[PDB]
Symmetry: C3
Subunit: 119 residues, 3 copies
């Protein structure tokens, strides 16, 4: 059934903000220090840029579940119950990710509209 | 290797039935009663409508794995071994879902064909 | 943040090699011997063909994480500790799979470019 509501065709300001996000190829700093430029290329969008094109059109990318934000506490380096080291933990950081399946949807809705030639 | 068969380019009646399905934005009745219209927008397709546009073109959406159906038994409210309540369970219902990765494929095959300008 | 590097718009030789890959409908030999042609149709790309269109344009599909390869040892038929059978195992084989989310990205980047009408 429908466990859904506020149901309707896709906002145009939204589709118009998405049309603003860019596609990139990039390598993960992770892999690259591991295998040098042996590291594979990945293709996709970039959260920080996304959160931005929606900001210009005056929207929030978080509201459409296109983007996530995550933040954390700085976890101890612990030697116990001696001067001995068991684990080396975390420096405080944060990270933006994306919710790819919601991004593909809006992308394909976007490219549906252009093909009707409304852009 | 190929663990595959009945291998061929994509049916045109199929692509023609898919071209029939609509994209929506909606909110989950779940979230909405939780956080009011604080609730995020999600973008996608809607199973019941899908099962329908294929029915008109005379096809079954289930055969291409675009859609799922699920149904269940009504599970007891149980107080044991006293008049005491441990768990409150289920009223019988059903639910249609979608298989999103198969849906994106057909969507992109669809929008490949239009661009050759076969639509 | 960005845990990313070698960051840039998407290679054109790459996009040009991808434009080369075909979409298919097929059934799994698995399902088909199970339920006959009761077996559902699935839509998508085919790894072996992918690895090939990139080879012609002179690229490797593995480098962009579009494709995987997997190979295995031949595991014993074991009856223990008698002439009795417990498990029937594996004949050595291999298998190419795909990494679908990376494939959709490049597909949608591809169909973005054609719509600017650079193809
Ligand atoms: Br990697
Ligand atoms: Br939500
Ligand atoms: Br199946």
């Amino acid at each position: 059934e429908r466990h859904k509501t506020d149901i309707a065709p896709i906002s145009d300001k939204v589709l118009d903000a998405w049309e603003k996000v860019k596609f990139y190829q990039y390598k993960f700093k992770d892999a690259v220090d591991e295998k040098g430029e042996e590291a594979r290329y990945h293709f996709g969008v970039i959260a920080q840029q996304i959160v931005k094109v929606f900001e210009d059109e005056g929207l929030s990318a978080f509201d459409y579940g296109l983007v996530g934000y995550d933040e954390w506490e700085a976890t101890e380096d612990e030697y116990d119950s001696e001067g001995n080291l068991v684990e080396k933990g975390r420096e405080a950081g944060n990270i933006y990710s994306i919710r790819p399946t919601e991004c593909q949807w809006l992308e394909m809705a976007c490219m549906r509209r252009k093909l009707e030639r409304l852009s």
